[PDB]
Amino acid sequence: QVQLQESGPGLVKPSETLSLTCTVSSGSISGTSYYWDWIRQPPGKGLEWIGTIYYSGSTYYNPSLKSRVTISVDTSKNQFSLKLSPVTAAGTAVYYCARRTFYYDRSGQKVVEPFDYWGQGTLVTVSSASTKGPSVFPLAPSSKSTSGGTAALGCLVKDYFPEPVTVSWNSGALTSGVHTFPAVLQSSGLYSLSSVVTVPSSSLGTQTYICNVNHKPSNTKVDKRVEPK
Amino acid sequence: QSVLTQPPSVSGAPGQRVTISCLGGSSNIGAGYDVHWYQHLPGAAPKLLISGNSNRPSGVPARFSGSKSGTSASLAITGLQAEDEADYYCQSYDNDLSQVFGGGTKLTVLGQPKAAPSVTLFPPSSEELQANKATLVCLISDFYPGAVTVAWKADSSPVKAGVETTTPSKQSNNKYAASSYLSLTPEQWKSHRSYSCQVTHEGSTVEKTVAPT
Amino acid sequence: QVQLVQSGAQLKKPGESLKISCKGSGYNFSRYWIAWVRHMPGKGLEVMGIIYPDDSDTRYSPSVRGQVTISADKSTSIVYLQWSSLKASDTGIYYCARFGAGMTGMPRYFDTTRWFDPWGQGTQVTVSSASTKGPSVFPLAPSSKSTSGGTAALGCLVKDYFPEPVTVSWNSGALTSGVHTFPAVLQSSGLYSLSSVVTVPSSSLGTQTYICNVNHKPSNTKVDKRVEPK
Amino acid sequence: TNLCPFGEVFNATRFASVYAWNRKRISNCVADYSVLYNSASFSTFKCYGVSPTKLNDLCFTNVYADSFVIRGDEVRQIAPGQTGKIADYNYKLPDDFTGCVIAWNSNNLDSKVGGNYNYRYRLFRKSNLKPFERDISTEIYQAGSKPCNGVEGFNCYFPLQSYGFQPTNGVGYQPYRVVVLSFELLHAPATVCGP
Amino acid sequence: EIVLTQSPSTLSASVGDRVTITCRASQSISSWLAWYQQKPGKAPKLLIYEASSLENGVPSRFSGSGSGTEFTLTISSLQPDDFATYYCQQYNSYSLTFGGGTKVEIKRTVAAPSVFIFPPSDEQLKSGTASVVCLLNNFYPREAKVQWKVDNALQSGNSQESVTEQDSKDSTYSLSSTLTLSKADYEKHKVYACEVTHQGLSSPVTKSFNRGECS
Ligand SMILES: *[C@@H]1O[C@H](CO)[C@@H](O)[C@H](O)[C@H]1NC(C)=O
């Protein structure tokens, strides 16, 4: 299938330009019966359509956001782009790009279907604060290793901004028992997250456990080993 | 085989009219696909002759005509001339096999009186026989039109092995020539009483015979 | 002016690789399809595969799947055809040709319903396990040609040589009338053989001396043979 | 008169399996499309890149008619940019497609008591079809590392399956005859010029 | 201009039950209503188009009815993988608008939490701060209480907690409570415990450590 991928800076100062770009792969942005759209979802709330573009360059914008919205397209890179020029606190949202297909009626009227294809969504935070890369600390297994049962180990990811961070264990080979918790905002203005996993206690001597922490705003790529001591 | 079927050969005299047929089916022409024709002149590459059933490109004279009907197509040449002597191919699109070519038709323009072959049969030389090899050479020359059949006879029985026969070749006098080689072992050549080379041309057979002595 | 220009003739051995080229000029290379057409010995014309240069959309026929690769370089405006391991059966002449309306959009998907007007000069591909070998020249003693009119033919046989060509002259080039050097045969061994004869009045035999001069430059071989009525 | 040979396609008695869809090329004729866009007998009448109401005022060099049979719930896949076993392994339309997709219920003709299994589709393939590409191969599908050697067995599947068209089935599992018209306009003069 | 109002805002039901969400429009949108499901973190996925028609791949337990200004989406047999938030959208108008969403949670049998405690890391202690972390694993229902005691003294305002979204296979939750102290205030007190009250525990569970543990 066709793939959509949102790209863009995750942090923007208020009253400055928010800019995102959507790259299409395994398909053409220049398709004659497609419409290309931007939608956003503020955190914990609902979905809001922003605007739509056609490969020729025609646009239709949401009247509420018209004053600040510009959507462009570049058929040569198979991309279309979004620009919110005076961004406000409302700009904090996960932004999606999507595609619809449209046809013409037997009557000759145009019919546009709902959104078939979506991107993965990228979060953009509107803030005066600066980027801060995370510190990664080990939540080491307890010394109950004699138990023939189950032990927990984890990774604490502390004092970072903005969101998100992603956490993996053993480069994805470890999925069962993993709980990567939602990040809490601290008084510091910095986020903090925990990622734990339950494993058989017998595995503590046999199997090395590495958590793989990623924070792209800061280009942080940390692999921390949780060891049993 | 070929999804489009052509005659292997058509023949005409200077000034006459001939047609080359192109026979197709439901998947090609029957579906609604047009036919194109190419002319492959001797010593040259194929060139477009007719596009879209009946449209001539520039440089193609109006003596060449094209038509399509039902599941068949036909190339027509009026006022036959020596220069028209070539291989002609029809071509279409097949809903199963994509772009398809006919088998080709060799057009011959008989602008020369018929000429019977000249056959010379040479026995194995003594030097070659002292090298434990033995070759019989049958040289055919000055025949028109340019197609012959060669059969070799051991004593009076047919030879079915060791024969290599060239394609016919245009001579400077515009008649044709050909050669046939029968490879034997010196012992076979001495065993039989006679070896014969028979050349057949337009239904007439000319034969020459050598004897080891 | 619109044209396609192909690689030159190739002599290769079985198992070797070959890549041959087809260069377009006088037209937008990216907007027209290119087809490889093979003309095998004694056979007709057949499409091996087709390619769209802008997209490098290549489609092959079943008879050529797995043994050849069709490629295209837009920057150089060249289409290629490549064999991984050549086989002797692949010996033939390979043409490239252009087809399509040159338009974009819907026409592109139906260009296969159209004609090859720009055609290449062809490349001759020869696959032989044979190596450079000089000819062995044997005399062809006089034999009766036409008994009415009393003509005899004598000459010499040029046997087991590779590659083409061979040159044959008579009495150093002072004999020219009645001289006929026949085109060569290609035997199952992969070596060429031919014959050269001279037609003389049978009565005149024994009065003039005939020497044939055979030169095969690939092997740097030169042979002079006296033909005599035995 | 020189009426376009539609109806030979739409009203044809036999329809092709989707994996082996039929194409008809059409030229040098006048076409009354109103027989189509004025008929309430069609379940799906969707045109991409053109409005059917303006077709009778237009002119094309060639028109290509593709036709096959599929299930009801699959007709949505006969459209640009769609996904599915039909859209990917049987019949695919291009991103720049100009033409129309017409379909109708054919339960009356294409189903039988006990089920009609004469209609077939391609279930497996090593790669998605390119637009308008057709595949009528019957080569054994290799789902695993062991070579199939042309014989069906474990992880060696015959790539084709048949539909089961029962008259009492649900609408979505009922046969639908599909006709796809494609419009190509060249610089050569337009011969399909319906009034 | 067109306002789509979704009811209920929240919905909790057991496996196999029938659930039904409602989308009410401020104006007539005919049948141009779509339904999306959004599992947390991921994009919305199209389920229903033209109010009643099902997109390819969507399981048959999903149905939609409606026309004009009232619509419904009905799940015939609720399954654990159906925990998403569901949205209706009108593509009838130029200004595309969405519903407010309906969150659908699964109801299941009570499962007691598994409690683990983690002392601060030596690396973090060098950094000048101390985060003691307590984990509650695979419990239902989400309602629970954690109490941090330090020297058997209840504490308040110095901790924070976070609960995972409901799992798509066992329909349980997990919660982490992180207690942040200064490096110095950590060095003063010796016993650090966390007490958990939850339905699946007949008695409250306490998990503690002393600042000198096995190595
Ligand atoms: C099929 O037949 C019906 C009735 O005979 C006719 O009205 C209709 O126009 C035909 N379809 C086409 C495409 O001509």
PDB file of N, CA, C and O and ligand atoms in Angstrom, chain D residues 6-7 10-11 35-36, ligand 1:
ATOM      1  N   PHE D   6     -20.404  -1.171 -28.069  1.00  0.00           N
ATOM      2  CA  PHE D   6     -20.864  -1.480 -26.726  1.00  0.00           C
ATOM      3  C   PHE D   6     -22.106  -2.362 -26.819  1.00  0.00           C
ATOM      4  O   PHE D   6     -22.780  -2.423 -27.853  1.00  0.00           O
ATOM      5  N   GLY D   7     -22.408  -3.055 -25.731  1.00  0.00           N
ATOM      6  CA  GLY D   7     -23.493  -4.023 -25.732  1.00  0.00           C
ATOM      7  C   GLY D   7     -23.018  -5.403 -26.121  1.00  0.00           C
ATOM      8  O   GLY D   7     -23.473  -6.400 -25.558  1.00  0.00           O
ATOM      9  N   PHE D  10     -21.319  -5.253 -22.666  1.00  0.00           N
ATOM     10  CA  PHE D  10     -22.181  -5.207 -21.487  1.00  0.00           C
ATOM     11  C   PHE D  10     -23.177  -6.359 -21.475  1.00  0.00           C
ATOM     12  O   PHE D  10     -23.377  -7.012 -20.444  1.00  0.00           O
ATOM     13  N   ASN D  11     -23.828  -6.609 -22.606  1.00  0.00           N
ATOM     14  CA  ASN D  11     -24.858  -7.631 -22.696  1.00  0.00           C
ATOM     15  C   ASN D  11     -24.305  -8.990 -23.118  1.00  0.00           C
ATOM     16  O   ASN D  11     -25.083  -9.867 -23.506  1.00  0.00           O
ATOM     17  N   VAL D  35     -27.185   5.564 -22.988  1.00  0.00           N
ATOM     18  CA  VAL D  35     -27.668   4.229 -22.660  1.00  0.00           C
ATOM     19  C   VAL D  35     -27.054   3.743 -21.354  1.00  0.00           C
ATOM     20  O   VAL D  35     -27.675   2.971 -20.614  1.00  0.00           O
ATOM     21  N   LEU D  36     -25.845   4.205 -21.034  1.00  0.00           N
ATOM     22  CA  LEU D  36     -25.189   3.835 -19.784  1.00  0.00           C
ATOM     23  C   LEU D  36     -25.563   4.782 -18.644  1.00  0.00           C
ATOM     24  O   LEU D  36     -26.197   4.360 -17.671  1.00  0.00           O
TER      25      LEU D  36
HETATM   26  C1  LIG F   1     -28.651  -4.479 -23.471  1.00  0.00           C
HETATM   27  O1  LIG F   1     -29.987  -4.870 -23.885  1.00  0.00           O
HETATM   28  C2  LIG F   1     -31.026  -3.982 -23.445  1.00  0.00           C
HETATM   29  C3  LIG F   1     -32.344  -4.599 -23.857  1.00  0.00           C
HETATM   30  O2  LIG F   1     -32.202  -5.453 -24.984  1.00  0.00           O
HETATM   31  C4  LIG F   1     -30.796  -2.600 -24.043  1.00  0.00           C
HETATM   32  O3  LIG F   1     -31.817  -1.710 -23.606  1.00  0.00           O
HETATM   33  C5  LIG F   1     -29.429  -2.084 -23.619  1.00  0.00           C
HETATM   34  O4  LIG F   1     -29.183  -0.828 -24.238  1.00  0.00           O
HETATM   35  C6  LIG F   1     -28.329  -3.074 -24.011  1.00  0.00           C
HETATM   36  N1  LIG F   1     -27.037  -2.612 -23.527  1.00  0.00           N
HETATM   37  C7  LIG F   1     -26.164  -1.940 -24.286  1.00  0.00           C
HETATM   38  C8  LIG F   1     -24.887  -1.533 -23.614  1.00  0.00           C
HETATM   39  O5  LIG F   1     -26.392  -1.676 -25.462  1.00  0.00           O
END
